[model samples]
Target chain A: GANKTVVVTTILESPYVMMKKNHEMLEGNERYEGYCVDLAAEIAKHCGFKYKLTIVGDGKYGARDADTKIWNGMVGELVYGKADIAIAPLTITLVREEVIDFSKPFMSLGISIMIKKGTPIESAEDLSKQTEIAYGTLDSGSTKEFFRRSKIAVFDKMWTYMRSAEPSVFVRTTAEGVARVRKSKGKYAYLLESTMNEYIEQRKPCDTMKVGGNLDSKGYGIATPKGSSLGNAVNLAVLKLNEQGLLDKLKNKWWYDKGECG
Target chain B: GANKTVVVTTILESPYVMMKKNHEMLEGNERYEGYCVDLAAEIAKHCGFKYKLTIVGDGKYGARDADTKIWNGMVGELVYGKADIAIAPLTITLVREEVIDFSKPFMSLGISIMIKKGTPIESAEDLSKQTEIAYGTLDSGSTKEFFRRSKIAVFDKMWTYMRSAEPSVFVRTTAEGVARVRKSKGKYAYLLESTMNEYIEQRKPCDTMKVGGNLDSKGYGIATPKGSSLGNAVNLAVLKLNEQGLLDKLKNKWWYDKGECG
Candidate 1:
């Protein structure tokens, strides 16, 4: 049937994928709303399919572990055929590309700083050289991997500094990190993607801000298992959206138009 | 003579235009070295002309006085016909555009925060709301001008905060500000152009870091008095150098490869 339902694996990131406040009354897809949820619906309509959104059980984007040698997160789900597609804030990286195929990027993103309104930190070098305010990225994410595998001098030095920083600067979740930025009283800075950073800046409790331009330029891509039949169709849908300026419209809708702060 | 020497006006800024160590013994353009010195040479060679590098007599990038309406700096040189071209790190701006023409940007930059390693500052929002650690930009230049004219809410609020912050946070020059970042012991964060921030990061006494992304996107352009004969040729020369990757090579030469810090 043309209405064959696709199982979409996404993460529990704010504004990208979030449970509705009144989700108790809603069933299935209506229970969720966000940039990714809206994006998923648009892609589904264009590709002539329906989808059921499911959060990744392991609560990660994806990473290949050493020693045990197994994939985890959304990439794992696709590799094991748990979902037909992944529509989330998943980054398109070289290692991930080797395992799962990705569609044309639907959203551009880069690592950025999240700080409370009064923190003095500015650039990555400032954080690297200082010890008063602590900083970290979400554990088991591409950002962490980036610094770990980085060859650039500044980032390489940063990784070395972060690895040895006392009391462990790494965080378990992006939410925890953002919360730290809010409550740390200028003592903690979170390194996260610019998309999420900007999204939070507009929401209530507007004490937080996404500071700085992105560190590196990259994008969030839709993913599927190797050679999935849905790959080409989804890619074309994204291109069409981009060409017709629908992607830009959706971004303005979720990020700016919904913003609470003036 | 076909070997006409174009009078090129540039400013003396580190890594952009610097007096070579043995400058006293050298004649003409040989006295100067650095990013713009190299760039001017490249542009002249590509355009089939010789150029004599002349430092702007006023030693400013050009700003129009509000009351008297007299322009100053390299901009003034081009306007007064004292120089044929400007090969300095002159930022492309709307006000400047109204008076003189700028070629395609030879380099991109933005307002960036330079901080000592331990400062709590991460974003402009952090600085905008808090009063603990003071911050400021070059007392003159596009960066200071950006916050002054910005209508965007965050930057507007920041401008208000900076304008009212007691004890006068503004610095007389980028060097004075960078020196403040180094000597303030995390009590101050210097807001300046990212190109210089990055250059400083790769230099010795590497205690300061560019903490966040640039505040906005803009670029450095070669300037000529409006409708000058050199505009098209210099612009095309920049394009050619960009295509040949010489611009990037020059940046690497001046910023990183020549850097004292590993």
Candidate 2:
């Protein structure tokens, strides 16, 4: 263990992880920056481990295909032994928890609505009662999966519409989802996690607003392969960070301190 | 296990578990009515268990004593085998998690400030900087523990003031704390869980308001003795109830639908 550096798999999600400016001239972890990057460093320091951050090769947030039953994305990397741990904004869900161990939640979030300015939408009830405003979630992520698996009447109805919408409402990335909302002139809304919605609302252009109370509550956790020795230490470290208020400080540093909008 | 009636320890916090007006004419579980009463019924139905609800002796939310090294209240009841499980507004914290097992959070909340309407407080930082307005948390509870254990500058400063304030800033119960805020004519403020703060704000005496974002985030969990056989089933049941939106519905029933101020 002393000779090996832990391989950490993450994703390229804005304000969570991103390529640094002039990244082409940098080497290794220096090429990346963002909330998760800062968090990974803090965790490594507290857990006393050396780690190498790697973006998941597949460019997905991990989901199971119905036909093959294989997990894709950062979760797949942990399941298949390609990474020792995953340090990202990976949501803690029942299915994912069944396959991997998660630290106590380092951050809390829920599914929220992102709308262009003056969208006239205030709640999920309003979204469900209307037809003119189109809405969707990022493909293969927990938000999409939540709607697909939800049995609540309002969510179930929303899923029915999203699954068969013309032009395929699902976008490949959070950035793409935000872009669609910004360009649609209040005609389209995006369903995504509140963390992303809040961060984007504070970014330059500030043309989008997060409307409605979140539809459900959950949190993001650091993930380790099942039975990994790092699980206990990492979990303890997360609690320590939370108790010390380091997580909150990091969140402010990335989300508000850097916010371009007033 | 099948022959024994499970002993469930709970508390008498309003809107969670409280005695029915006709409690004197009722027997056993029938005497109690509130959110947790309904929640207990749902949990028992899902787990297929016969149970009796009993109030935690000593009426304190569990906390460890510094001198005697003993635990008291609901947590102690579970630790000492006086109760098989606890279903109350008991917060899930690291210290409690060390000795007991908690089902995934059945409800999410954070510590928030409750002020008499028209008082000029907006955030923790604002409160920390001033001394004319006094603020404190419910004694022997998670909110008090949070301040005592906090290392953050603003919280630490507030704790310094509250711990040594003349006339004792702490209150024995949430009702006492709310009463203090309501009667102090804006001189006092109460720090409590957002769920309780939000609930009280909508009650008949609507002279209180919850201001600022919550200081920290956590959730309430159904708890069992460490290594209990019921742990897995109870945890799964909470997840199921959350996914099916039963928890949200119960919250609405008790906290908002009957909101008199609205």
Candidate 3:
């Protein structure tokens, strides 16, 4: 088992995970860095398992098409016997909870807004009431879906713009969405993760700012396929790390040190 | 319009935005770097606008607590009118979407897994079938909710673990979970974003790896308060950047190019 190799699937993001500029120079594990890197190391040590951190080449995360009903991304990896365990930002929605065993929330955060500094606009009312300045979110994201299915106050207001926007101004990733906002000079604004928004606010240029109160509440959790044996240990491990202040250290390391935000 | 100064509220995460250790050394509008930095520059140039980016002092983002019904973070900034624009990875959840406006997806991804480099388990089925290793998901995270709401085969299997998990084995954040996994050896695993997993995989001492497929499909979008006129142009800005391969470049620069993955 010690020699066994487990394959992990992930994507490329910043703060949580990222590669070193001179990764080649590093040894068996020196090649990688970031919060996830440090966190993964701790988890593996507790789990008594070995693994490989790799990108999901398919680029499609596990989700059934509203019509197709086929699984893709990490779901497939598990279904296909590609991996044994997973440690990523796999959300814990009702749909997903059914299939995979998630541990506890490794982090707590909510959806928030990202805007450039010094804009005339503020609040949903400010955005909802105006048409001279356009605003939108990434396509096919949780935010957009929220708008699609929402019938409530903030959701209702957001739905107006999401449905009416032409070409449905969508970006492929959070980076792009944030980029647009940063480039727009108070013209463009974006809403995304509180974790990420906080991280970006500290970086250079400091032209971008976070606006509004968090419109929603949500958190991040770990995941495993349903019925894995490591459930207890894994979950316990997470809490232990938290109590140890390891989480705080990693956050500061990833988002602060070697991070532009700091 | 090009020379405007406004109050900005933002979070303090790294590689996107952050306060400098010697922030006092920098003049107005020259305190951060990373992707947001470049993006802010470009967006401002295109919009013919200028601004000063400031970090949100509040620890929480703009979200309405279901129990308390209070907003915080960027949402707080917007409602209080501290900044004109906000840019961050705020999810477009229904609660927030209703109150805020958003653009199309800049990046499309779902929560996924991050396992040890050599996990013998391949997929969710593996975890479900085994009893020796007990694992769980993150507490208060999107992934946790995904599984809770999921009705698919894999997710259905996962619900069991989450519902009955003993000792309340839940983590508060991805970093906490990952640390548990690394320390747990083969016993623990983490579930998070594919983006983060891959980035870690490419890092040093990469004993961990992302396995299986992503479990869901979602997008991260740019959000604004509902009905801002900047929607169209900002969306266009994202599209243009995407077309120019800028997004890809940034990923490499921050995560791959200089990163140490494998």
Candidate 4:
């Protein structure tokens, strides 16, 4: 009734998945560290299953390209039966919900503003009201889509400013956005999920900070292929972890323990 | 039959409870406007009860004065039966839980670092290791009590550094701490609950930001006197609001709709 080893797909993200410095000498799950790796172990132990940790082949959380209509990354793997489950910082959106199944959110998050130490911009409206500091969200993700499709007056105005701005305000990735915030010297801000923003803020050389309330509220859910047998077990596993306080404990272990800034 | 009026005790805190600008012309609950006022209205209507809102005379969230050996603020009012319910951003701490009952957390929060622009302090570890920037928590609340009694290695170390710091790093109030951060430039950091930290970040002038992850995990719960008759009805009302999406809707109404920065 069950495969010898369930294929668990994840993505490479800080405090979520990271290749250890000596990963070559480590075997199987030992080669990985961070929140997701820790979470996977706990889930497998509780659900009575064995799992092989595999990074998403194309290296993305997941997205469907407009032109090709093909899903890529973790979501793609799950939809096509390439992986039994996906456990990572993958957001639960309405579009994705129709294609696959997601467990109740394993974590809560939302789009937030990141600034260099002294940027005067505080809210989306502040950004829309001024041209002195340029702002942008991830070029291709839910955050970008949120601003692009939003009808809220403040965000709609922000979308206009970002879309028509000179010299290409948008960046292809979150790392690029962080770099821009660092180098722009109070002249640029990047919008991304609050979860990642908080993680980066605590790391070494932490010159930037997350400011203002998150623009929206959502959560990262453990996803499964539609009608997959693993869905129910994985969902129950997540709820048990949450109720036992293991999720909170794992968060502290990866994020706060051995923090570089201290 | 229910009492004609339920007296509710709460504190004076931003975005929670505050006297409206037109208070001189208003009577009773009409004089207040904020998250709690909106919440109270919803709870009363759902529970089929009329209520009177009153500010805690001591103006503290709830704590036993070390010298007087008496509980003060909302906890005092509730325990002594002066008020039928206490609602606000009242933290659900173990000490409080032992004295009275709290509904499941109406909202979640944790302690966080508040820093002005350009501050090099990135995490609690950074604060513990540094001698340049002075830091402190509110003098008389749970945050202060947390550090004073903490046994965790990093926090224990932080407590030692803060306790011995010259010129006294402890602050008398949240407002005083915010003012110090503004006037001290990047040399002062204040530690407070994340709920207040995020609220203040969106206010005018927006000079400070909440950096790093929250130092710990906690939540705010609605309190009622132990075994009171109204307790079940009030708890059910909160659950109904949460399940029907009314709680989220109310948060947006108060915190985001008229947000100053946007």
Candidate 5:
């Protein structure tokens, strides 16, 4: 086991993982940067292993295909033996946990609403009560699934509206969703994890804001194939990092200290 | 295994677990009522087990003594086989995890500050910098441990002041800490879990407020003895409750819908 380098499959999500400006000239893990990139390095160092950071083949965040029953995205990579671990902003959900093991949460977040700076909406109830402004979540992710399965009255009503909205409310990527929010001028709102919503709110041309308290609570975890021996070591490492304040430090380094907006 | 009635060890914390007003006239589980009482019923139903709820003997949240290497409180109940499971507002911490199995978080919370309304303080950093105002946490719980072990500048400074403060800043129970904040007339602050802080802010007098963002994030989990047979089913039960939104519903039932403040 020690002879092989751990294959770390991650996604290229801003502030979590991203290509550096000089990536074209760099080799191996040096080509990537961001919160998970730093986290992967620390995990490997603490766990006493060498790891290769590779972007997941598909850009998706992982969901099981209803028809084929095949998992996709970083979760797929772990389930199929293509990667040894996943150190990305992958959400920890019940379905995924059944097939793979997750370390204790490295970060906590919740579903939240993102609005253009001047949007009149202040809460999900506000969005559900009106129709002039359209709202949606990124497709094929926990945020979308939460709405699809939620039975709470307000969320249920919101989901009913989003499922059949004309022009389709769901987008394929967080970037696409954010772009839609920025370009829609107050006519559209995006439902996303509070972590990303807050990060984007601090970026350049900060015309977006995260409104209201989180709708639901959850956390992102480091994932490994089911029963993988690496799971124990990685879980302990996460707890240690949390105790030492390293996780909080990395979050600040990537999200706020590097913020383009004041 | 099904023949034995499962023994559940819980703590008596307001809103989580508490004796009912007519408890003297009631018998068995009917004597107590609270969020955890409701949660225990759901968990037992889902797991198909007959159970009896008992309060942890010492009324402490559980910690290991340095010299004797003996664990006290609910954690000890499970460790020494006094109880089969613990369904209280028990925190999932690393040291506890080493000896017990905790289901995925049934609830998310963080260490937060509680202040009498109109207090000038806004954050932990503010408390760390001032001397005229005093602050402390529930003794022997995660909040105290967080500060005792934290390496963060602000938290470390606050701990330094607390460990040696005049009149002893730590309180034996959350109720004592809340009373201290209420009666100190702006001279004292109580650091507690955000869940408790929020619940208290809505109580009859409405004299307290939860200030600032949480200092750290973590969750409360249902716990079982290490290698217990019930671990698997209990973990799945919590995840299912979370997905079905029952946990959120119960939270509202106990914490907000019954609010006396407004």
Candidate 6:
């Protein structure tokens, strides 16, 4: 169920992974050419997996749930054999690693605060060393868990305050927290990953970005279900790409050169 | 030997405290304005002490020596009573805090690895995960201490291996590490506060930069010789400058924004 015309489920995260303006006119990995797109090509060559790039239908990629273990979305896709591999900025965290297999991080990132331009927030520590600003993460995700597991610095101290915040501001998705910023006047700042912030900054209404530094040290992995065969091979592919300079080259293309998905 | 008449000293590490390039002319805090600078001003105002902004005689601002107890860097400046208050990027650790008092950090940072345009490292963990590529921290400092104290990461694991490293690449100062990186043909990377990394990136022969993610979460604080009465007031002033948003403003003037030291 997880291989052979494999479903490489991912989200449309702009320069990283996204539906091309002419997505319907394309086929296979050739449909786009951003960082993830090219990485997927090298991965296929390395892992020998013929794949299908299926965008998650609900647009909800890696989310967790306590009650049903449903993953609530694409993580569920991988866990339930609906998809074989996830080539996205999906973070490698304690819980996710417990439930799924992850390749070494294809990228390293941390939770960052994004505010519309002119928002007073300058850095994460700055965001935390405040009482007036409200910060939160994508519900039941890596950022939330980072605060929960962190044991050092102001971030840990700030987490304690955020966890007990009345009428919690945590939202269901990264996009929601961002919407909180876009819809609300500079009052609400969204906390999410740096990669996503960069992604949204290029979207139509583009008005947000990374203030301060990262929260915890974590990275994005190419994930597969609990016992999938693809994990090890994909991890090796990433390492190889790192050595060959392919990852750095493509990162510049998508992250800086401003290109479409592959 | 430390007293109320203590001449507090600091380094112009961007938004914290900075020296106006031609400080021989202008007087007072107006010459500086970023986060750290604002922090210095407010802390001075709160403590009711007159402080001077002096660049560390040599940039090894804070490194400890087991013999003589002759602390002389910025952190040393505090321990020696040469400075009553220390409001700069002085990293906090058990040994330093034992000898002096530091406010709860107003800003947080950790030793991070910076590589040139094409280094394979994405996180300290990344460098640590592999055995072929060698990486170490500024010897005897917090970065190395993180490796020495860590329990569960690849970095700690790598450090355990480096304990018996043959060539002894362990260095005594951050600048020395920069020289090592420049000559090592990508075999070396310098680990230091992002503040210093940012500073160096702006200085001459400036090619170094933060690579991947910060290795740990800790902070830079305002310090005083232990048990000094000025501690609380100086700490209070730092908070005020931060709240007023004056500190960060002053940093940009000197660092990246307002053009060179002047």
Q: DockQ values for all predictions?
A: 0.02, 0.50, 0.01, 0.04, 0.56, 0.02
Model 1: per-residue Cα lDDT over B1-262, one tens digit each: 4557789999899999999999999998899899999999888888888778899998789899999998999999998899999999998775676688776567777789899988998888888777788888877888888888776677788788779888788998778898888998898888899999999998788888998766765668899998787876787687557534577678889999888877
TM-score of 5: 0.96
TM-score of 4: 0.55
Give the least accurate 10-residue stretch of model 3 chain B, judged by summed lDDT. B6-15
Model 4 pairs in collision: A262-B125, A262-B126
For every candidate structure, what is the RMSD over all alpha carbons to the true structure, in angstroms? 14.2, 2.2, 23.9, 10.2, 1.6, 16.4
- Evaluate all candidate structures by whole-model CA lDDT and list the values in order: 0.83, 0.90, 0.62, 0.82, 0.91, 0.67
How high is each candidate's TM-score? Answer: 0.54, 0.94, 0.48, 0.55, 0.96, 0.49
Per-candidate iRMS values, in order, are 13.0, 1.6, 17.9, 9.1, 1.4, 16.3
What shift in Å separates residue B192 of candidate 4 from its native position after superposition? Answer: 19
Report the lDDT tens digits of candidate 5 across residue range A142-237.
Answer: 999998888889999999999878889999888899999999989999999999999999997889999998998788999999889898889889
Model 1, residue B184: what's the lDDT?
84
Task: Tell how far residue B25 is off in model 5, in angstroms.
Answer: 2.2
Worst 10 residues of 2 chain A by lDDT: A94-103
lDDT of 6 by residue, A43-130 (tens): 9987787887877777765666668656755677887788888887777554555567776455655577889877888877777777
Q: Which has the better TM-score: candidate 1, or candidate 6?
A: 1
Model 4 lDDT per residue over B1-262, tens place = 5367989998778788889999999999999989988888988998898899999988887887679867887998998889999989888665676566766456667789999978998899999887899998887878887788777777888889888988898887778999999999788999999988888887768888899988766667789987787766676677556544577677767767766776
Error of 1 at B40 (Å): 0.4
Index of the highest-lDDT prediction: 5
The Cα RMSD of model 4 versus the native structure comes to 10.2
Misplaced by over 4 Å in model 6 are A1-3, A27-34, A129-131, A148-176, A200-207, A259-262, B1-262
Q: Once superposed on the true structure, which residue ranges of model 5 sit more than 4 Å away at CA?
A: A1-3, B1-3
Give the top-scoring candidate (DockQ).
5
lDDT of 2 by residue, A13-88 (tens): 8888999999999999999999999999999999898999998999877788889999999889999999999989
Stretches off by above 4 angstroms in model 1 are A1-262, B1-3
